[PDB]
RNA sequence: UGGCCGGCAUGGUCCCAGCCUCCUCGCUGGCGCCGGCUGGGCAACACCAUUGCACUCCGGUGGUGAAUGGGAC
């Protein structure tokens, strides 16, 4: 069931008490050094809360981030990271 | 009061201060007691449920069942 490499990483187990806008800014803070980020998609709906899609421009970036930040304490919770199942439209509209 | 009716108590006007609050956060809002009818919203705050793969915002419930004193005429 393991996913294949993707420009986008999927993060979950994120503290749900954090507002969308702050969450996006914070995530960008810790993940930017891995490479250019095209966007970070967060939502608070029942189905999507506690998860986020950080979309990296280059898969290598999505790969260090995934290995380097796995389990990183963030807002008191261990961040769980994977590769997103399919592509993000921002990436389709290019690659 | 978010919108509305009743009961009771209470002389008036004004100044200061404190305080209160989901629905015009303040100095031309309110701040004796009690019952009842009933709308919006989850934006903020709180709580319940949720470990969930998206690229259209989008689960639920709760709060006003609130808050005092002094002074000048
Ligand atoms: Tl009311
Ligand atoms: Tl009355
Ligand atoms: Tl009097
Ligand atoms: Tl009086
Ligand atoms: Tl006031
Ligand atoms: Tl009443
Ligand atoms: Tl209501
Ligand atoms: Tl819908
Ligand atoms: Tl008084």
């Amino acid at each position: 069931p393991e996913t294949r490499p993707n420009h986008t990483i999927y993060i979950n187990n994120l503290n749900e008490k954090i507002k969308k806008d702050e969450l996006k800014k914070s995530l960008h803070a810790i993940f930017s050094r891995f490479g250019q980020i095209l966007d970070i998609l967060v939502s608070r709906s029942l189905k999507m809360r506690g998860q986020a899609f950080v979309i990296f421009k280059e898969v290598s970036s999505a790969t260090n981030a995934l290995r380097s930040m796995q389990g990183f304490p963030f807002y008191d919770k261990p961040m769980r990271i994977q590769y997103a199942k399919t592509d993000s439209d921002i990436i389709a509209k290019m690659k």
Side-chain angles (χ1 to χ4, degrees):
Chain A
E2 65 302 76
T3 307
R4 296 293 101 188
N6 205 313
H7 283 68
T8 299
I9 55 170
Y10 162 94
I11 314 179
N12 85 317
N13 190 222
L14 294 180
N15 186 312
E16 278 166 41
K17 279 302 79 190
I18 307 300
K19 297 167 190 308
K20 175 188 177 177
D21 183 43
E22 166 179 349
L23 188 59
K24 269 155 76 172
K25 303 256 193 54
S26 282
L27 280 174
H28 185 89
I30 66 188
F31 279 106
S32 79
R33 56 113 155 182
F34 288 102
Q36 186 163 310
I37 296 186
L38 302 178
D39 199 11
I40 299 189
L41 274 33
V42 174
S43 179
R44 301 244 275 158
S45 50
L46 176 63
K47 179 188 192 193
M48 300 292 83
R49 70 188 54 176
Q51 309 145 54
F53 297 75
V54 186
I55 306 171
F56 286 105
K57 186 176 194 182
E58 304 199 0
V59 197
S60 24
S61 298
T63 306
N64 318 322
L66 178 33
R67 302 183 186 159
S68 311
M69 305 309 301
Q70 179 71 57
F72 177 80
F74 192 69
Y75 290 107
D76 312 308
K77 292 169 68 62
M79 222 182 242
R80 162 159 58 275
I81 311 161
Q82 306 174 194
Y83 281 106
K85 283 159 165 59
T86 87
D87 271 26
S88 304
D89 305 338
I90 354 304
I91 277 299
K93 297 160 173 295
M94 300 178 79
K95 299 198 169 186

